[model samples]
Target: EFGYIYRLAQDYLQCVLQIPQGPSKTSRVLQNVAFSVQKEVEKNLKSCLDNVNVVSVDTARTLFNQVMEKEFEDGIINWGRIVTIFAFEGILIKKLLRQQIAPDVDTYKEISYFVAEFIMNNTGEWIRQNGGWENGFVKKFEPK
Candidate 1:
C-alpha cells in the first residue's frame, strides 16, 4: 500500500531521465515527470474507483476522511523519519536530477522537500479518504 507512492516516484524519475537539455530541458523534464504521474494516477483511479460516488475531489476527500477517520484519529506514520530518510537518499539532488535542464537547484530542492513532507504526512489520509483502505483501528491502552 505505502509502496505504491515510492514506485510512482521511481517512475517519475524514469521519465525525467528521458529528456534532453539545452534551453528548456529542466522545465521540460519536470513537466514530463508530472505528466507521467498524472497518467499513472488517472489509470489507477479509473481502475479502482470505477464504481464509486467520487464526483468531485471534495467529495472524494470528505468520503475519505469519514471513512479513514480512525487512522487520522489514531495513526502514526513517522513523517519526520520518512523525510529524514528521503533527505539522506539525496532525493532532492537537484544537479543529478537536472543534469540536462538547469533546474534552480535550491528552489527545486525546497519545493521537492515540501512535496515529500506533504505526501508523507497525508498520503494515508488520501488513501483512506479515497476509499483505498479502511482506517486502521485506533488502539487504546488502559492503566491498571
Candidate 2:
C-alpha cells in the first residue's frame, strides 16, 4: 500500500540503503545521523504533500504514515552513511585507546594515570570551557 513512501525515503534519504547485503552492528554515535536524516525526510515530505493537488493529498498522507514504519522495519541501514557520520569520533576513540589505554594502561598504576591524566587533560578542559556540570553531574533526564 505504501511501498512508494518506503522507496522514496530509502532512496532519497539513504536510510535503508544497506551495503554488504547482510546483518552488522552500527556504532551508537552514528544513530543521530539516522535520526536527523529521517527528520529531514518527514519534514520535506510534508512540504511536498502540502502543495500537491487535493486528489493526491490523501495518497501523500498514506505514504508518509508508512515512511516511518518502513524506516524502522528495514534493517539495511546505509553503512557508508554511518561511516561518514562516525568516522571522526571512531578515529579519535581509537587513537585515545591506543595512546592512553594500550601497553602502559595495561598496568594498574598506568590505568589510574590513564583515567586521571588523559581523560582529565583532554575532555575535562573541554567540559570546563563549554559549561561545567552544575551539580557535579549532568542532568540525568531531559528537561521539560
Candidate 3:
C-alpha cells in the first residue's frame, strides 16, 4: 500500500515537472490545482525562507522537510494536505531552477523519494483509512 502511494507521489512530480514546457497529457485538473496551491503556499514560503537559499539538494531537502513539518504539525490529513504536498514539490522545483540546478529526472526522483517517505511515515495510515487515492484524493480534487 505504502509502496503504491510512493509511486503515485513520484508520478505526480513527473507531471509537475512537465508543466513548464506545455500542457500536461496527464491529470490537467491536478496540474492546475497543484499550481494554484503552490502559489498559495509560495506567498508564505517567501516569508518563511526569507534569507534562505536552496543552493544544493541538501538545502532543498532541509527546506522541504521544514515546510512539511510546519504544514503537517496539526497531524491532519485531508485533500488540502495532499495538494499541499504537491505544492511543496512545485515550489522546491522552482527554487532549484532559480539556483540554476535544472532539476532533471534523477533530481525529481530523489525529492519524490523524500516526499514519499514522509507521506508513508506521517500520513499513510490516515490515507489508507480514508480510501486511498482513487476514492479519496483524486475524487475530491477532480473536476465536478
TM of each candidate vs. truth? 0.28, 0.21, 0.78
Residues 64-125, model 1: lDDT tens digits: 34534553456654333222323322322322343414334333333334334445466656
Candidate 1 pairs with clashing backbones: 26-101, 64-129
**Per-residue alpha-carbon lDDT of model 3 for 1-144, expressed as tens digits?**
656655656666666566333333234556678788877777876777556667677888888888888887887777787778877887776667667455454676777788888888888888878876666666777777
> How high is the CA lDDT of each candidate model?
0.38, 0.32, 0.71
lDDT of 2 by residue, 1-144 (tens): 123212222222222322222111221222344455544544666666345332232332343335424543544433333223222222222233334322332232222232234224433444355443332122221132
Off by over 4 Å in 2: 1-106, 134-137, 140-144
Stretches off by above 4 angstroms in model 1 are 19-33, 36-94, 98-118, 133-144
Better of 1 and 2 by TM-score: 1
Q: After aligning candidate 1 to the native by TM-score, how far in Å is the CA of 134 from where it should be?
A: 15
RMSD (CA, Å), each prediction: 16.0, 22.0, 3.5
Say which prediction, candidate 2 or candidate 3, comes out ahead on lDDT: 3
